[PDB]
Amino acid sequence: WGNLGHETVAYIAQSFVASSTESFCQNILGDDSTSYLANVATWADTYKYTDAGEFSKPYHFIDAQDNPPQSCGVDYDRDCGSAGCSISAIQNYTNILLESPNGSEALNALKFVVHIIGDIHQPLHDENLEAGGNGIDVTYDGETTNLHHIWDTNMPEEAAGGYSLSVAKTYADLLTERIKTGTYSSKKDSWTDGIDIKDPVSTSMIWAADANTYVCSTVLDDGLAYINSTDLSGEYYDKSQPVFEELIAKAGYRLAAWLDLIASQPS
Ligand SMILES: Nc1ncnc2c1ncn2[C@@H]1O[C@H](COP(=O)(O)O)[C@@H](O)[C@H]1O
Ligand SMILES: *[C@@H]1O[C@H](CO)[C@@H](O)[C@H](O)[C@H]1NC(C)=O
Ligand SMILES: *[C@@H]1O[C@H](CO)[C@@H](O)[C@H](O)[C@H]1NC(C)=O
Ligand SMILES: [Ca+2]
Ligand SMILES: [Ca+2]
Ligand SMILES: [Ca+2]
Ligand code: NA
Ligand code: NA
Ligand SMILES: [Zn+2]
Ligand SMILES: [Zn+2]
Ligand SMILES: [Zn+2]
């Protein structure tokens, strides 16, 4: 996701973490503001464009080598790669926070977890094709862009009504209510099925696999003829909105559950 997406996920997590988890995190981050997670949710995206952080570029995604929209699937051993991926990163950085939450590495580890759990839920971050669709040019609201970009940025920002931190906060509130009492409230207790602090690879693979199903059902199900030749701000946006909104919600809720486990469970 772009910035609004990451901040939204983070504000959602803030609304579900236990009070003791909130403490734990605030302490690591040196920030007790009401935006403590949201304030760090985009950091990894800066860092990957620096010399020092170049190594972390692969940690944003897992390039699933499947055949959408006919066949979707992710496989850790097949798809992670020699430089690492989102899944291996969640393993590493979770372990750092489990075993060395007061070491020098904890602060970045936590910032990475916050960001990467968000990225795992962007379906095109779990797809190899055309570099997660970056190489697929599209039209959106009369302008040329690419498919990855409209998922990261144009569509969620249109849905939210903007792109700043304050807009992220309002969008997070909308989606948080959907989890607590609204249209996601009867499904959300299944969203944490299979979660296991002692098997970060399995756990993050569940999430990556879940998001990847939407590559087939939603992102590319219209086919490339339609994707290449229509303005995707019409019916395509209408079809995609309930999916990206649910996935952002899942990311925030799963992030909260994960942080709660980090702040409380043994290795
Ligand atoms: N699923 C993805 N989501 C976002 N960026 C990606 C994805 N897959 C590859 N990329 C980026 O696209 C570029 C080329 O990808 P590759 O040919 O897999 O090395 C690299 O800079 C990758 O970081
Ligand atoms: C684990 O984290 C350290 C600290 O950022 C990093 O330098 C190392 O490359 C990481 N390894 C993996 C496999 O994520
Ligand atoms: C759609 O465009 C992509 C490149 O952006 C190309 O790979 C693909 O073959 C095109 N498909 C059709 C049916 O035009
Ligand atoms: Ca942006
Ligand atoms: Ca139910
Ligand atoms: Ca359950
Ligand atoms: Na790759
Ligand atoms: Na611990
Ligand atoms: Zn992102
Ligand atoms: Zn992206
Ligand atoms: Zn990212």
Author numbering: 21 to 287
Give passages from the manuscript:
S1 nuclease from Aspergillus oryzae (EC 3.1.30.1; NCBI sequence ID: XP_001818636; S1–P1 nuclease family in Pfam, PF02265) is an extracellular, single–strand–specific, sugar non–specific, Zn2+–dependent, fungal nuclease with 3'–mononucleotidase activity with a pH optimum in range 4.0–4.3. S1 nuclease has the phospholipase C/P1 nuclease–like fold stabilized by two disulfide bridges. The active site is located in a surface cleft and composed of the obligatory catalytic trinuclear zinc cluster supplemented by Lys68 and the nucleoside binding site 1 (NBS1; also called Phe site in the previous studies). A cluster of three zinc ions coordinates the substrate/product scissile phosphate and the reaction mechanism utilizes water activated by Zn2+ ions as a nucleophile.
Each of the two protein chains in the asymmetric unit binds one phosphate and one molecule of adenosine 5'–monophosphate (5’AMP) in the same binding mode. Phosphate is one product of the 3’–mononucleotidase activity, 5’AMP is a product of nuclease activity. Phosphate is present inside the zinc cluster, 5’AMP occupies the NBS1 site in an inverted orientation with respect to the standard substrate/product binding (the ribose moiety is far from the zinc cluster). One of the phosphate oxygen atoms replaces the water molecule W1 and binds almost symmetrically between Zn1 and Zn2. Another oxygen atom binds asymmetrically between Zn1 and Zn3 replacing W2. The phosphate moiety of 5’AMP interacts not with the zinc cluster but instead with Asp83Oδ2 of NBS1 through a sodium ion. The adenine base binds inside NBS1 in a position almost exactly above and parallel to the side chain of Phe81. The water molecule WNBS1 is substituted by the amino group of the adenine base, which enables a deeper penetration of the ligand, and therefore we denote this binding mode as deep. Hydrogen bonding to Asp83 is realized through the Hoogsteen face of adenine.
